[PDB]
RNA sequence: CGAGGGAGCGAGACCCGUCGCCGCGCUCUCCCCCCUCGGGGGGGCCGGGCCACCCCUCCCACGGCGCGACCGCUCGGGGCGG
C-alpha cells in the first residue's frame, strides 16, 4: 500500500500529468496479460427425527404494510457528521485565551 | 437566500448499487528514504521522439532597402506630313 505518487496544487488538480503517471506508476512492465433447483443457498441446522430439517434465514415478513414509500436517489454527495472536515480559524491557536459569549459562563475569559 | 426530484411492491439467493467526467490512491513488479498513531509523505523503475531550451539549412507569409523585366503619364533631340 505505497502513497501517492503525485503531489496536489490545488484541490482536486494532478500535479505532473497522466504520462508522467504512466512513468511515475510504471505502467509499462505491469500488463497482466490475463486472457440452483438442486442445492440449497445457505441453510443450517438439523432435526432429530425424519432427517434434518432445512432453516431459512431472513425468512419473509409476516405482515406487509398497505403502502410503503419508494427509494431515493442518494444524492451523490453526503456524507456521515463523523467523516466532515473540522474547520478552525486562524486566530484560534493553543494557549490563546477565549472569550465564551453564549455558555453560562458569560463573558468570562478561558485558556484554549 | 434556497435545496423539493425520488430509474426494487420477486419465489431458497442484496429491500443496492450507481451512468458519463477530471482524474487520482493502491495491488496482481521491484525497492529505497523521512517523520513514528502500522499511517502519512517523498524518490523512483524506460526507452522514444514532436512542441521546442543552446548552435545550422531549406519552402511559404509579411514589411523595408537595392537591382532587373513589362504595362502607363509626361519632358526633350531628329526625320516625315501638317
Excluded at 441446522?45 to 419473509?60: A, E, P, Q, S
Excluded at 472536515?85 to 465564551?100: E, H, M, N, Q
Aim: aromatic share 8%; glycine share 8%.
Amino acid at each position: 500500500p505505497h502513497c501517492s505518487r503525485n503531489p496536489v496544487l490545488v484541490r482536486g488538480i494532478g500535479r505532473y500529468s497522466r504520462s508522467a503517471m504512466y512513468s511515475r506508476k510504471a505502467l509499462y512492465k505491469r500488463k497482466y496479460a490475463a486472457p440452483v433447483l438442486a442445492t440449497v443457498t445457505k441453510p443450517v441446522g438439523g432435526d432429530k427425527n425424519g432427517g434434518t430439517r432445512v432453516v431459512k434465514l431472513r425468512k419473509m415478513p409476516r405482515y406487509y404494510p398497505t403502502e410503503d414509500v419508494p427509494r431515493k436517489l442518494l444524492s451523490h454527495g453526503r456524507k456521515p457528521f463523523s467523516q466532515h472536515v473540522r474547520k478552525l480559524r486562524a486566530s484560534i491557536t493553543p494557549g490563546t485565551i477565549l472569550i465564551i459569549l453564549t455558555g453560562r459562563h458569560r463573558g468570562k475569559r478561558v485558556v484554549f
